[PDB]
Design a protein around this ligand. Structure first.
Ligand code: HG
Length: 157
């Protein structure tokens, strides 16, 4: 219900943009946390973005592949933070398992990938992030299905 498209020529643009995205994120608190869905062909500016988001904040380290696992978490400038890889998940059983850990409450920004499996426990996202990519560069609509999404996008001008 609110779209927004952005051109990303190379690395450093995924990072300005990656990191530019989150501070908007960080200024508004949460009743039900800020859903944010990551979506592209594997290897299309996914991780690059993710890091861009976390290290554009104060993550001195590495974004640990959330592969062998599911939710790797952080906590930054008055916000907890959780990456999610839903790839090795077929059963949402395992989605019901972390959420019981204070992941959806006050001060919680959950950023998730492979949302196919996150249809049950897993909420619907305020900001649907879809990332285009051909030869060198990338594209990305910042679309918002809900009300936080309508105004998180709007935050970019
Ligand atoms: Hg979450």
């Amino acid at each position: 219900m609110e779209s927004l498209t952005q051109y990303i020529p190379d690395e450093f643009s995924m990072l300005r943009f990656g990191k530019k995205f989150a501070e908007i994120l960080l200024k508004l608190h949460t009743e039900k946390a800020i859903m944010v869905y990551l979506n592209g062909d594997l290897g299309a500016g996914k991780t690059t973005l993710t890091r861009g988001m976390l290290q554009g904040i104060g993550h001195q380290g590495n974004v640990k592949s959330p592969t062998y696992t599911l939710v790797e978490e952080y906590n930054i400038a008055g916000k907890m933070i959780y990456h999610f890889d839903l790839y090795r998940l077929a059963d949402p059983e395992e989605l019901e398992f972390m959420g019981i850990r204070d992941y959806f409450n006050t001060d919680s920004i959950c950023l998730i990938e492979w949302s196919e499996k996150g249809q049950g426990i897993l909420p619907e996202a305020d900001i649907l992030v879809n990332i285009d990519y051909y030869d060198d560069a990338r594209n990305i609509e910042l679309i918002a299905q809900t009300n936080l999404g309508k105004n998180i996008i709007s935050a970019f001008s």
